[PDB]
Amino acid sequence: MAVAELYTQYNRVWIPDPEEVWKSAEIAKDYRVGKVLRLLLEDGELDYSVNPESLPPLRNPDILVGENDLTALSYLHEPAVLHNLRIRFAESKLIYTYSGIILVAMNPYKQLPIYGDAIIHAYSGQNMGDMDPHIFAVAEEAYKQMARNNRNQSIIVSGESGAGKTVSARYAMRYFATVSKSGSHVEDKVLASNPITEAVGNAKTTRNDNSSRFGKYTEISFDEQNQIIGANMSTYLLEKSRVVFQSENERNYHIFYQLCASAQQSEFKHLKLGSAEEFNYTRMGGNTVIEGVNDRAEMVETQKTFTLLGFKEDFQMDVFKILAAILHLGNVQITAVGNERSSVSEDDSHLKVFCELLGLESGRVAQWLCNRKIVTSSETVVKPMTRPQAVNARDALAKKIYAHLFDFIVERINQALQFSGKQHTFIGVLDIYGFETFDVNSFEQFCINYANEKLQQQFNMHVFKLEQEEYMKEDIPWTLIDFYDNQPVIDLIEAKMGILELLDEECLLPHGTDENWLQKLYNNFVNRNPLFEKPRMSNTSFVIQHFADKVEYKCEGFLEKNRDTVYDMLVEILRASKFHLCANFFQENRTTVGSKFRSSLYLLMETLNATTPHYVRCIKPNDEKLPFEFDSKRIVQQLRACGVLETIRISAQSYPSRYIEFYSRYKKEVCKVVLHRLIQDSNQYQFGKTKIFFRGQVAYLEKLR
Ligand SMILES: Nc1ncnc2c1ncn2[C@@H]1O[C@H](COP(=O)(O)OP(=O)(O)O)[C@@H](O)[C@H]1O
Ligand code: VO4
Ligand SMILES: [Mg+2]
């Protein structure tokens, strides 16, 4: 129709380019309705092959600065979004951009002076959209709605590893803490909870120098005057294998390096530590230092933060003792005796420190690192362990001790953040590990990536399903916006016949194996479920089509990691610990890791669904942690994965403000003909079965009051 009349001389379009995904091209001669199109490139010209139905994407008119909200784009398509963000990022140094209520945040990889108190208060009391896009605006909007509607809110940040979720979450929490002040100083303690959990919960990966290896949901509690009174942290599966293993250029958890960097301080001498390079549990990656990070200085800050939360020096030394003990455990020499047996010397210097610190008997530990007890009714058998088996038992114990320590710190943080008053409302801040893939992906990545699928599902259910259904039930004209439903890959993972259920099945077999489980995966899903693949050149791995990328998983270690057990005799020894904190960990007060995880995510998703969400979509602009560097191919891959274009389409098309409430606030044939004969714009508001939808057309009537 008129479409062809838009493609004329002097006009520009987007065409595929390998490097920048899309490249611009100017139209030479006007277009004729119905097969080709002549364009003048930046360097030369060609007759662009064209589909008369789907002509090349029209380019938008240049503006001095990229529009603050992408819904404002006349021609809404992928090239427009990619280009607007590039211009705002590379040229204007703007990391934040609106897609309606949904915020897009680009990782600058550079400190920006835009988070000060003056700016915080400039955003306070303002309406969403009045100010430039900013994480504070998202936070203010949630605060505004909580107070005005007495409704619980959620800040839900998303994106792949290193995109900037944790940073966004912390700045949102800082905003809340500042505008709630002056409380009659609980705010300082709520904020302190983040860096503590980072010290024991974050570590350097090749994607992120400060990668979160656990999921976090922090409910911030408010009183009736909307002042912070406390908070509660829910954590989700910590990466345990991190304690005893690192791949090249990766580190263990930060606090180990903070501790080792403090080895020669007087207060720490009794822990008998050395450099991080002495210990097997911290040296494995080949590099113990993070560029720009002084681990000794971080130890000092960590100690201040513990103190801020009310954890005195003795409490701090007690956790440091556990951490030191774990390090020494990793350096306990286990030697091979023949081919079937292992041995640990009771005089092993690291074993002695380990036992001194945790108050254990060295003869007992050495014995039961290298042997296992088998109790039947008829008898008790003691079998030797091979050195590999002994190492595995040793490392399992280390992981278990650390897991308890982490839970213990979280629990005590929650005790310190408790309140006696009544919780009027709360704002929940979600910060979980983001999508990640490496040369070698295992059980850890599978769980993280499954969690990210569920979050994308929760986003989609709210933004696309629930929202568009409301319109259809209210019976108004609505053109449907398509989105990619990731329910299938989710079912493949979590449902009755799923990967995780099959893993649980194999784990019940006493002679279960990773290989037998993998074969069952092949048989059930190869050439049967499209989202499941077997590489042509591998009989040890499987591939999953996730919303964001395809990921290849090695089967090795899935059973072990799903079972997550320690030998009874080792647990019994630590249960008899003469160190109070350790004995508490292993005191006596079925389901697998995979099953506990599913249940935890189910409860989290329904927690979120019972709040008003506020979505922040974080994008990692490049893979080299470079300041304001725009990698087009990687960015467009993330935009597609998060359904950013579709989010903008439904954002532009949606009615922001939504009969019985109409009359009383300020039959249905009357109220309509009343408003119709009141405002000359019939398009400025659409009437439904039981509600009238106002396009900011609703704000006009407000000021008339
Ligand atoms: N707004 C920001 N300002 C400055 N640096 C940032 C910002 N967002 C991210 N970064 C940098 O990127 C790093 C990784 O971000 P992070 O939030 O920890 O990632 P994740 O999404 O995996 O939680 C930050 O620790 C910092 O180096
Ligand atoms: O690297 V992040 O795990 O914190 O998503
Ligand atoms: Mg993080």
Swiss-Prot record:
Residues where N-acetylalanine is found: 2
Domain annotation Myosin N-terminal SH3-like: ranges: 8-60
Positions with a binding annotation for ATP: 159-166
The Myosin motor domain, residue ranges: 65-705
Actin-binding, as annotated region: 601-623
Top-level taxonomic group: Eukaryota
Tissue-wise expression: Expressed chiefly in non-neuronal tissues. Particularly abundant in epithelial and glandular tissues including pancreas, prostate, mammary, stomach, colon and lung.
Job of this protein: May be involved in transferrin trafficking. Likely to power actin-based membrane trafficking in many physiologically crucial tissues.
Membership in a protein family: Belongs to the TRAFAC class myosin-kinesin ATPase superfamily. Myosin family.
Name of the protein in its database record: Unconventional myosin-Vc
Origin species: Homo sapiens (Human)
Residues of the full protein shown: 1 to 752 of 1742
